[PDB]
Design a protein around this nucleic acid. Structure first.
Length: 50
DNA sequence: ATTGAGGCTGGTCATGGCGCTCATAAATCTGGTATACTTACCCACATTGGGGCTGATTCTG
């Protein structure tokens, strides 16, 4: 739910993008892995107050 | 500057705990009726306004 009124489910997103649900899942997992890769999001890691 | 393989782009098949929906049920929430006789509670100032006089110009017997 980023920069929009509401979020969209994975199936509606796949339908809008003409991409299967599993391919959408794999692309999301690749994006999450790339964000978990180091040398990035250092301020995001610093955003924890514990 | 080609043709022989690895990494990575397309989709397969269910899969699995989660959430919305149906139904049961005792606890919680509402309305109702009692026929010996019981009858009235328990500080000091300053200002404006209302009501009772107080003359003072108009009229009277």
């Amino acid at each position: 739910g980023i920069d929009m009124n509401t979020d969209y489910t994975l199936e509606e997103v796949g339908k809008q993008f003409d991409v299967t649900r599993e391919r959408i899942r794999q692309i999301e997992a690749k994006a999450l892995r790339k964000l978990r890769h180091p040398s990035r999001s250092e301020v995001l890691r610093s955003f924890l107050d514990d």
